[PDB]
Design a protein around this ligand. Sequence first.
Ligand SMILES: C[C@@]1(Cc2cn([C@H]3C[C@H](O)[C@@H](CO)O3)c(=O)[nH]c2=O)CN([C@H]2C[C@H](O)[C@@H](CO)O2)C(=O)NC1=O
Ligand SMILES: C[Se@@+](CC[C@H](N)C(=O)O)C[C@H]1O[C@@H](n2cnc3c(N)ncnc32)[C@H](O)[C@@H]1O
Ligand code: SF4
Length: 338
Amino acid sequence: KPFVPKLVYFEPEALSYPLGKELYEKFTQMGIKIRETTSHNQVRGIPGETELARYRNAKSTLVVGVRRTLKFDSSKPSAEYAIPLATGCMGHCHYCYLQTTLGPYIRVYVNLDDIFAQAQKYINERAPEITRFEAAATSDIVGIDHLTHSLKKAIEFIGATDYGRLRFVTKYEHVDHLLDARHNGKTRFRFSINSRYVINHFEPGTSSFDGRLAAARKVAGAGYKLGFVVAPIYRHEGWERGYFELFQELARQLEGMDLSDLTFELIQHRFTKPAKRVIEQRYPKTRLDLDETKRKYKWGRYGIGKYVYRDEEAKELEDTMRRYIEQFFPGAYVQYFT
Ligand SMILES: C[C@@]1(Cc2cn([C@H]3C[C@H](O)[C@@H](CO)O3)c(=O)[nH]c2=O)CN([C@H]2C[C@H](O)[C@@H](CO)O2)C(=O)NC1=O
Ligand SMILES: C[Se@@+](CC[C@H](N)C(=O)O)C[C@H]1O[C@@H](n2cnc3c(N)ncnc32)[C@H](O)[C@@H]1O
Ligand code: SF4
């Protein structure tokens, strides 16, 4: 059930680090097909004759490498920065924004000393103000972590700092190895949730809603700060009742738990102009409605723009989500709607 790659690439430089050495001996012991990248770290020869084939096989391929870009991206509204522990995902969410943000093997970085050292510099440059880090900005870091334990190390590193905070969101239940981690109350452990329609139709290759909630109870019992990310908020047929049933069912599955300091994050479905065509050839018979005529185009600033719902329909979603959260989780804090 936990993700295990069917193909692994190693950057030569990765073998100079403890994690690279450990992963090399791990995957060779497991008899998994292991390859070397070029001297300039390019991944060549991923199986597949069509574009869709190489996309599928890429999502079953792991690349063990070194993070050379030590400048951290900003990650608002979640956190000040994105801490780069991994890139890519094993899941096949039809709407996924990684389809345009990438183009899709799973990359993991081994130079944790360097990455954490850089994280500490960002913390020092803003202290005594709090600096939050998003570890799942460009990947499902939790779904990958049983292989590496990099997130666990990041959790404990952040736990040792005074002004640092960590956060990440996942669609996977494979969190057992993280339960005895010394988080020190400085990690927000979030789970992506959605209506039954969106999960059943658009989220294959992820854990079930029940699995995610089972995992959510485990992490909360281990003392982690708990939160949920309701995204993508998607106006499907019967969305108002669909999302009502979500929060009702969510409240039922978290019965008899300390839900003080529970957070919610709300993201409406969004897609870029290229995504329409890219998704059409990566998921041909998807029910995902990418009709531009029912959307508002929000023009980009430094990046490319994207379609979102019109201001009025967006407010319907926001007001509705806020109403259900207040009904089923009194005192819970909605961090943002975007
Ligand atoms: C898990 C995320 C992390 C995140 C990612 N990203 C990056 C990931 C990728 O490079 C890009 C996707 O448009 O945006 C970002 O800018 N801000 C974030 O807060 C995901 N998102 C993203 C996706 C959305 O387009 C953007 C704007 O809120 O933020 C978010 O709102 N909440 C989060 O907590
Ligand atoms: C890219 Se996701 C990375 C973390 C992890 N693999 C996870 O799925 O939780 C970050 C969040 O953003 C949502 N999301 C993904 N695509 C979109 C989208 N196109 N529109 C609107 N939201 C989109 C996902 O449901 C997640 O809640
Ligand atoms: S689990 Fe997250 S990162 Fe992975 S395909 Fe789904 S939305 Fe994308």
